From a paper:
Moreover, crystal structure of [name] with an ADP molecule was solved at 2.7 Å; however, one internal loop was disordered (residues Ile400 – Ile409), and the ADP molecule for crystallization was spontaneously hydrolyzed into AMP. While in AMPPNP, ADP, or AMP bound states, the “TG loop” was open, and therefore accommodated ligand binding.
RNA helicase [name] plays vital roles in ribosomal RNA biogenesis, transcription, and the regulation of host innate immunity during virus infection. [name] is composed of three domains, including the N‐terminal domain, the middle D1 and D2 domain, and the C‐terminal foldase domain. In summary, here we reported multiple sets of crystal structures of RNA helicase [name] either in ligand‐free ([name]‐apo) or in complex with AMP ([name]‐AMP), ADP ([name]‐ADP), or a nonhydrolyzable ATP analog (AMPPNP) and a 15‐nucleotide poly(U) ssRNA ([name]‐AMPPNP‐U15), corresponding to different unwinding states (except for [name]‐AMP).
Numbering used by the authors: 188 to 399, 410 to 563
């Protein structure tokens, strides 16, 4: 915890909860929270949202700790949508502070126990909007002495219809336009319109906000039409004076394809079953413009000097992903965007996702 001003006492209590270092949401918000800045945080479940406000709030409060006076008003108000979530936030506070009085006020429980806690004095108050609004009406609860307000799981509170109850509580604790109002920490995962209306009505003018080359095409094609569609994509992306390299896994398929009526007239084959003398000649032919289509096998190309192309075609999702990405970087001539086409069948659909994941690319599925 070296980067942060967390006391040795708090560090020891934190190790009991299995906290030895801060999660990203915590490290990013700590100083905004500690320094008293207003904040809107967007974070998913399990990211450690509770400690991102609890740890810096407890540290700030511990540093300004004035004698525990009976009947004291809360300094912190945490609004939570449910009893279950309010009890977890309370426990999280209680487990890392042995100096501050932590109260949990939810509805559908006797008022007596809560009135007693209010008389003894509260430092940190966690509660559901209903019960907090009740004790405001009673007069018994004083929320005009607040330094900090946390609106936890805002989305859930809105989905449950607590918008108007929260706005009522906010109207008591906040003065419209005051730069002296409590510090507001808003926790909304999706940030609906209500969040930005609350921010411009109750929050400070300035607030922090924290969140948490080649075209690759994939064509679904039945093997019986592949050669016809190959002729069509060449016509479109390569055309006249163009260069296309087709990659076929088997030496048979590559030979069969270079001889297919759709491309045969402008194509030449290249594989392991062709002499080194024929290979250097076909490479010269491709490089000088004797033919525009070079049909090859993924392995029989590995160390070969292939010129810049306009279009790369894989007959099926490649096994050899590094050969695919290397050849992809040599596509696109005269400032035109390079095009890599990948043909696939329904059985090869997850294979496409594997290529996407290994290569760090996303295919346009057509
Ligand atoms: N820095 C941390 N190290 C270890 N566990 C943590 C840390 N921050 C939060 N947690 C735990 O992660 C879980 C999810 O946190 P939360 O989303 O706040 O409920 C809880 O069980 C926390 O106790």
């Amino acid at each position: 915890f070296s980067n942060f001003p967390i006391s040795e006492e708090t560090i020891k209590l934190l190790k009991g909860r299995g906290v030895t270092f801060l999660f990203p949401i915590q490290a990013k918000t700590f100083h905004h929270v500690y320094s008293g800045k207003d904040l809107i945080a967007q974070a998913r479940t399990g990211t450690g949202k509770t400690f991102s406000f609890a740890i810096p709030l407890i540290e700030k409060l511990h540093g300004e700790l004035q004698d525990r006076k009976r009947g004291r008003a809360p300094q912190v108000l945490v609004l939570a949508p449910t009893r279950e979530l309010a009890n977890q936030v309370s426990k999280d506070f209680s487990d890392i502070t042995k100096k501050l009085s932590v109260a949990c006020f939810y509805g559908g429980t006797p008022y007596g126990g809560q009135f007693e806690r209010m008389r003894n004095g509260i430092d940190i108050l966690v509660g559901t909007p209903g019960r907090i609004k009740d004790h405001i009406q009673n007069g018994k609860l004083d929320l005009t002495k607040l330094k900090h307000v946390v609106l936890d799981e805002v989305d859930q509170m809105l989905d449950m219809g607590f918008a108007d109850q929260v706005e009522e509580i906010l109207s008591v604790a906040y003065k419209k336009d005051s730069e002296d109002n409590p510090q507001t920490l808003l926790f909304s995962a999706t940030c609906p319109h209500w969040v930005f209306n609350v921010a411009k009505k109750y929050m400070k003018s300035t607030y922090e906000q924290v969140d948490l080359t080649v075209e690759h095409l994939a064509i679904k094609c039945h093997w019986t039409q592949r050669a016809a569609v190959i002729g069509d994509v060449i016509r479109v992306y390569s055309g006249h004076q163009g260069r296309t390299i087709i990659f076929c896994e088997t030496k048979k398929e590559a030979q069969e394809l270079s001889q297919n009526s759709a491309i045969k007239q402008d194509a030449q084959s290249l594989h392991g079953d062709i002499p080194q003398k024929q290979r250097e000649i076909t490479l010269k032919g491709f490089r000088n413009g004797s033919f525009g289509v070079l049909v090859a096998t993924n392995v029989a190309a590995r160390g070969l000097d292939i010129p810049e192309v306009d279009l790369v075609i894989q007959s099926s999702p490649p096994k050899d992903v590094e050969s695919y990405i290397h050849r992809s970087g040599r596509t696109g001539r005269a400032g035109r965007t390079g095009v890599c086409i990948c043909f696939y069948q329904h059985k090869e659909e997850y294979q496409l996702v594997q290529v996407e994941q290994k290569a760090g690319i996303k295919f346009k599925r057509i």
